[model samples]
Target: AEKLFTPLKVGAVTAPNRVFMAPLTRLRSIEPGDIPTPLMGEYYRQRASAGLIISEATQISAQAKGYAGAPGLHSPEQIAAWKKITAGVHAEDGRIAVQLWHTGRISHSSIQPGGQAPVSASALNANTRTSLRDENGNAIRVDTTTPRALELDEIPGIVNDFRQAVANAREAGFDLVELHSAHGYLLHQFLSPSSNQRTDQYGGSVENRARLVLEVVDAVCNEWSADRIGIRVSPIGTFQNVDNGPNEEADALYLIEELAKRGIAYLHMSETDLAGGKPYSEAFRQKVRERFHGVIIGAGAYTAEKAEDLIGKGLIDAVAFGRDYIANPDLVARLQKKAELNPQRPESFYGGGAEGYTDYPSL
Candidate 1:
């Protein structure tokens, strides 16, 4: 096996090795605005030795944020702060990509900067509860209370927001920009039937439901080189009841083919493994390999051995480490040397300071 230390070329850039630092959202930014903090820069710089770095999901606009302390690229101040973060990462010879995110209805009215309501593909609220909170430990679900479905006229604005965010990422010194279409975000909402109840051109059919995500990718790839762009997708994940269709396989196949036609750099797939099973099925992964001709980065609970096996078997070009990178900042080196990982702090995975963010020691 080539192992994790093997150098790889993804799109127009060459990575140091095969271990990718996954996009981890730690709410460690400064207040008022979730601008990038010096600690944030240091956090990424610590993991600069990875094959590639995909920074935490940065909001594309104010309406795109669902959680507090997440950084944004829409504001000038945030852009400047992120520029410094990128510069610091680059100084360490790290290849980093900025993940563009829009939380859709995963928001509360109070979560908005000006206390505005959350927007989404439909007026329906998400089936899940918000992850935010108040000082008293009470549930805080105000901003995303019953988001109104976006109108046809309003869809273009959302697409433009992604494009503008890509411009901002380029300005902020990102070598690559990934559209966060996975999880239960805005783009994924359009792909799921339960989340997209619209009877118009945007719903009822697979092609229509996948239109927005493709358009957003098309727009973003137009600004930055297609080689500098990647898209993340979670095909079968039913998180927040977003993947509500019986034909998830069809949806997954369509996405792979259509996204590959765009010549995107990579298709980052997240297969949520529950019950100790791999998320992606053998049939699905094989079909995807035939359809999607670009580099494929598989994420979601992959161990060091699994990553090596996938690369060796030619199932995927790279593997992205999420929580592992949090605990082992030098995950690439650890895997290369077959070193054991430091245990990650479960409580501080999300909102916190350097305790779980960057305090983990390397072996």
Candidate 2:
């Protein structure tokens, strides 16, 4: 309990506590341009009690978008709008990071640029659902279409998009940047052998499969210091049709080792069962602890007690709460006082106004 309240160093910034906010998509960004709105700023400002608030996964390019209403960082207007959101968080003395994303095969033509098919490492279809806009501009869930395999020549463009997005994040006043390399996204698709069926150097062995991710990391590192950057990976994650292959554990260890060598700020692991997958084992957690030297943030259905216990045991340096923060704007205070939390309304979780978002009462 005492340690949970203690200050911790996360990369270039010093967090005042160990509890952080995980990136949860609420689909409230303004449509048409996918710009951040003032309402979203209020939403984050309400939860500024978190040591660090990771914004919802934002697309790095128009072609990267897979869902309706998720914000992007590619355009000037989008960056300017995000500036307000970050300013609001800073006004409350809260630190925030933007999670850059590319959805890969988890998209439909309805949301892609010029109605083109989504791109991936291979022409594979994710057995998952994505949000799309209807005739009335309402978001609706639909099955993702099969994505076309990215041509070898076009891979550099994808890396360039990520590099530019990191620069955009800096311009938007983000304290740091996080690359979304998990949950069967574009980067994760390249990492998992089950999704990457390419016969080129970017596929086959573990090293080959991890090349694109490392390349993107290197590109972003060129723009920002490694210490100010972080990445999220779901080692055994099966969400969004991620199969991790037969060498899942070994591949994860290799990837973590490589990332550790880069000295990134933290490694966020989404170990929750809410993704409709099995939880990670203690042994696996230990393996990650041994491989990654920097801070490790464990997220997924965490309660204060569970977080404290895990932090006390040194299994994780911090805990990232997702749904908990959505319903408890003053989550840190509530945890400190051991008070009851407001229940989250699932129906109002996405594509809504202030009902289930900023209306939650704080202690």
Candidate 3:
């Protein structure tokens, strides 16, 4: 408990505590330009008590979009809109990072730029559902559409998009930038054997599969220092039908060694708590620590006690609370006091107004 309250320096920003707020999609961003709204700012401000707030996954380009109302960093309007949100978080002395992403095959053409089919490492169906708002501003789930594989020549465009997104992140006033390579998204699409079946330079072997992600990281480093950059990965990813390739452990650790060599700020492990989802085994955790020499933030279903134990064992430096932060804005305070938490309402977790978003009481 006490360890969670300690101040720690993570590359560019120093958090007052170690209770990080994991990035999550709320589908509350304004449309037309996919800009963040004032309401969104208020929502983040309410939870400024978090040691660090990794913002909801933000699309790096128009083609990167997967869900309606999910924010983007590809436009001026979007960047300006994010400025206000970041300002609000900073006003309360809280730090934040923009989690940049490309949805890849996890999308429908209707939501893509010019209604084009979403692109990924290979032409494959995500075999999952994505969210979109209905006529009444409520969220509805629909099956994801199949996607086309990215052409060899166009691969550089993806890398450039990530670089450009990081530039936007800086102007938007984020303390750092987080590269989302996990959760079966675009980056994950390339890394996962289930989604990637390419035999080209970008696929085939595990090293080849990792090339794009490493390229993105290298490009990101061109804009921001390696120490200020954090990348997220689900080593045993099976989300969205994107399973870690045959060399799941090898692939993750290989990439991790490269990251450690470059001296990235931290590694965010987005683990799973679903009924059938695999959690990281102790052996794997220790293996990661042995290779990656930096801070580790463990996300996915964690209690204060469990987080405390992990921190005590030196397995993780912090815990990223997901659903808990939705219902308890003052999560850090409550955890510090060992107070009861407000139960989360899944009904209002996605789209809609402030009823279930910002109306939650905070002590």
Q: Report, for all candidates in order, the number of backbone clashes.
A: 8, 0, 0
What does candidate 3's lDDT look like per residue over 254-343, in tens digits?
Answer: 888988887888999988735347778889999998898788999888888889888889988988998899999999999999899998
**Which candidate achieves the best lDDT against the true structure?**
2
Q: How many backbone clashes are present in model 2?
A: 0
Write out the backbone clash pairs for model 2. none
For model 2 the TM-score comes to 0.97
Task: Tell me the spans in candidate 1 whose CA falls farther than 4 Å from its real position.
Answer: 133-144, 273-278
Order by TM-score, highest first: 3, 2, 1
Off by over 4 Å in 2: 273-276
Q: Which candidate would rank higher by lDDT, 2 or 3?
A: 2
Candidate 1 overall lDDT versus native: 0.84
In model 3, residue pairs whose N, Cα or C atoms come closer than 3 Å (at least 3 residues apart or on different chains), thus clashing, are: none
Tell how far residue 178 is off in model 1, in angstroms: 1.1
Measured with C-alpha atoms, the lDDT of residue 118 in candidate 2 is: 95
Residue 327 of candidate 1: its Cα lDDT? Answer: 88
- Candidate 1 residue lDDT tens string, 1-363: 365787788988899688898888776666567699998998999999988999999899988988877789999999999999989988999999999999998887777767877888888888665656568432234434778899899999999999999999999999998888887888998989889888888888999999999899899889888998999888875665576379988878988899989998999987873323336766777888999888899988888788888888888989999988988988877877768789878788766677777788866
Evaluated at residue 280, the lDDT of candidate 2 is 74
TM-scores for every predicted model: 0.95, 0.97, 0.98
On TM-score, the stronger of 1 and 2 is: 2
